[PDB]
Design a protein around this ligand. Structure first.
Ligand SMILES: [Mg+2]
Length: 36
RNA sequence: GUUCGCGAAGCUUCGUGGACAUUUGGUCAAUUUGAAACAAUACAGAGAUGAUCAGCAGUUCCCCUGCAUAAGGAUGAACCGUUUUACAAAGAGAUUU
């Protein structure tokens, strides 16, 4: 059948889409720091 | 045109030097030939497995709907096929020098 297992994943870079994702929206702009 | 000065005619009118203001818009030009899709007809037609059916993924130089990192698309699409060598060692028989 085609109900099939696998060998490897992927990572290929295209031109960015420019879509306004919900999570990507700004939040926690301030980074904290340590004392020293 | 505005005007601030000069020179001629009768504050009114011509002739001049300046100052003011200064380069728009087009990745495009209006019907077939620079690329939309559904639909329709005809023809078939539904994942495993015997059959019926659920859902989830996975790979991809396939996308669509979706605000979407939800979710959904025929289990969304194509995958179901082709598949003969890093190839050596031992034994037996045969023709050629
Ligand atoms: Mg289904």
């Amino acid at each position: 059948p085609q109900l099939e297992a696998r060998s490897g994943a992927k990572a290929a870079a295209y031109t960015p889409t420019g879509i306004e994702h919900a999570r990507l929206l700004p939040g926690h702009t301030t980074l904290k720091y340590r004392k020293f």
